[PDB]
């Protein structure tokens, strides 16, 4: 149960930050370049 919770929360967080990066790129193109680096800083 703990492992399933960990996997589900990891998937949720991944989709969270993917959507947040996408929208930050969308409405703020000038900050698009660091955001991808942020992914490189995280992933």
């Amino acid at each position: 149960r703990s492992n399933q919770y960990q996997r589900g929360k990891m998937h949720g967080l991944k989709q969270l930050r993917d959507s947040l990066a996408d929208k930050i790129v969308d409405e703020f193109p000038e900050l698009k370049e660091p955001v991808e680096d942020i992914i490189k800083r995280t992933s």
């Binding site: 589900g8 929360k9 949720g12 967080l13 969270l16 959507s19 947040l20 929208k23 409405e27």
Partner: protein, 52 residues
């Protein structure tokens, strides 16, 4: 009338409260169905953008 500096303080306090609520929802909800969670987070992110 309300002075715009007081409105600015109210806006920044509401922004801080909104970030606290959003991260609390993330912390207490990570694991709820993925679709409903994603929709609620999209609403919260739209709220973040509008507050900005």
């Amino acid at each position: 009338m309300t002075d715009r500096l007081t409105q600015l303080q109210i806006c920044l306090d509401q922004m801080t409260e909104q970030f606290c609520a959003t991260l609390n929802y993330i912390d207490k909800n990570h694991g709820v169905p993925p679709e409903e969670f994603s929709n609620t987070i999209d609403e919260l992110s739209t709220d973040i953008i509008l507050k900005t």
